[PDB]
Design a protein around this ligand. Structure first.
Ligand SMILES: Nc1nc2c(ncn2[C@@H]2O[C@H](COP(=O)(O)OP(=O)(O)NP(=O)(O)O)[C@@H](O)[C@H]2O)c(=O)[nH]1
Ligand SMILES: [K+]
Length: 420
């Protein structure tokens, strides 16, 4: 079932790594020239081979084939040639593969792990570069480890790449069902159309394709009595895996409860963009200064969700319901957001300029370079002398500096340390 792609510029030796691992052609899949993976090789997957019968010239071939790969394949082996380092022609191929939520693994062809010394590869922004010998097959196993690892994260339910999926999560009786039907009744929304894909509500808002994942979970309770939360809770954690934005909805009336932290924590530690919703705010009786007293109340108990918005709204009175889709669309953008490597590093340079780096006992930390590695959430790698020397307090001081530069509200962000 999993389908691996093999993208790059022309003459990087795609076909030499393709014919190494591509087994036998299979002309009963959702089909192209499809090849089952090597029978000798112990992972099982499908090679996709690009052959789309627009414009013909130099630049407008990579457009065509990378697009096809981006659409059908589940993991994408972006492949470069190491015989002269990176090219601006490759940087352009990287720019085409930036427009995709699916994971992309860099392959540096014809080098050692040694000759893979150039920061230019990391700058492309698909994480660790993996060196290969297309002649000898060296370094191909560790590569396919990085490919196969992403098979346990491949969705069972898929949509068009332009579609954005999300979920509403919360305890028993907080208005998730009411909230959604208000958002459907909403002015700007249009709907769509048995069982297999009759579980998620597919609407459009501002001519943008949108999926609410597991409306079936809303619709279950209504035909079924409450045996336990433990089933709804885990059915929500299943939806978060499929989703990209988690709309973590509280009840304004009772306030925050132990169990709220459980379902939200998972979304943070899943890495998804979080947008908190305080429903039933009509039923909250207000004074001069209570709504901000409710926020500062939220930020103690949810101190792992700082980056998230907090809204207040109501499904009954229809107050601030219009705010919901806006906040989502924002979280999606920030969650998907990819940054430019020159700009990033200047922010990192600026970061040290203000606050001196950590001292240990003479040997001070130095930051050499910094690159974004993947999106959703946006993940960064700071290159230093000593990864152990960069402490978390400094590590997130860089987050806040990076958040200042490119916004980031809605998304969490990953910072890593590598060396050498
Ligand atoms: N006053 C007020 N009541 C609300 C609001 N939103 C929902 N409710 C009430 O909250 C009750 C329970 O929430 P419901 O709409 O079923 O959504 P739910 O939290 O998904 N139910 P479940 O937990 O079983 O999935 C409903 O009977 C509804 O009338 C609101 O904005 N204001
Ligand atoms: K270097």
């Amino acid at each position: 079932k999993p389908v691996v792609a093999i993208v790059g510029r022309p003459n990087v030796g795609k076909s030499t790594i393709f014919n190494r691992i591509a087994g036998e052609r299979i002309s009963e899949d959702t089909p192209d020239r499809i090849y089952s993976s090597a029978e000798w090789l112990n992972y099982d997957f499908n090679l996709i081979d690009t052959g789309g019968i627009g414009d013909e010239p130099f630049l407008a071939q990579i457009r065509q084939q990378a697009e096809i790969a981006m659409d059908e394949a589940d993991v994408i082996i972006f492949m470069v040639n190491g015989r002269e380092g990176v090219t601006a022609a490759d940087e352009e191929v990287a720019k085409i593969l930036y427009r995709t939520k699916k994971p992309v693994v860099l392959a540096v062809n014809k080098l050692d792990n040694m000759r893979a010394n150039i920061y230019d590869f990391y700058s492309l922004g698909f994480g660790e570069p993996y060196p290969i010998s297309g002649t000898h097959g060296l370094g191909l196993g560790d590569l396919l480890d990085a490919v196969a690892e992403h098979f346990k994260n491949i969705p069972e339910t898929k949509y068009n790449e332009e579609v954005i999926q999300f979920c509403l999560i919360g305890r028993p009786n907080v208005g998730k069902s009411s909230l959604v039907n208000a958002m459907l009744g909403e002015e700007r929304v249009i709907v769509s159309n048995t069982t297999r894909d009759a579980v998620d509500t597919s609407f459009t808002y501002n001519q943008q394709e949108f999926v609410i994942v597991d409306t079936a979970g809303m619709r279950k309770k209504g035909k079924v009595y409450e045996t336990t939360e433990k089933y709804s809770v885990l059915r929500a954690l299943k939806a978060i895996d499929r989703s990209e934005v988690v709309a973590v909805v509280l009840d304004g009336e009772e306030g925050i409860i132990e169990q709220d932290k459980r379902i939200a924590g998972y979304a943070h530690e899943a890495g998804k963009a979080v947008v908190i919703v305080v429903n039933k705010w009509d039923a909250v009786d207000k004074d001069e200064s209570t709504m901000k007293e409710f926020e500062e109340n939220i930020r103690d108990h949810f101190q792992f969700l700082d980056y998230a918005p907090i809204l207040f709204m109501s499904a009954l009175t229809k107050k601030r319901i219009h705010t919901l889709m806006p906040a989502i669309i924002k979280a999606s953008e920030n969650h998907s957001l990819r940054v430019q490597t020159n700009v990033l590093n200047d922010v990192i340079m600026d970061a040290v300029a203000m606050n001196p780096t950590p001292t240990h006992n003479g040997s001070r930390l130095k930051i050499y370079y910094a690159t974004q590695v993947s999106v959703k959430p946006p993940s960064f790698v700071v290159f230093v002398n000593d990864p152990e020397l960069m402490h978390f307090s400094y590590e997130r001081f860089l987050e806040n500096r990076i958040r200042d530069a490119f916004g980031f509200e809605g998304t969490p962000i990953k910072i890593f340390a590598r060396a050498r």
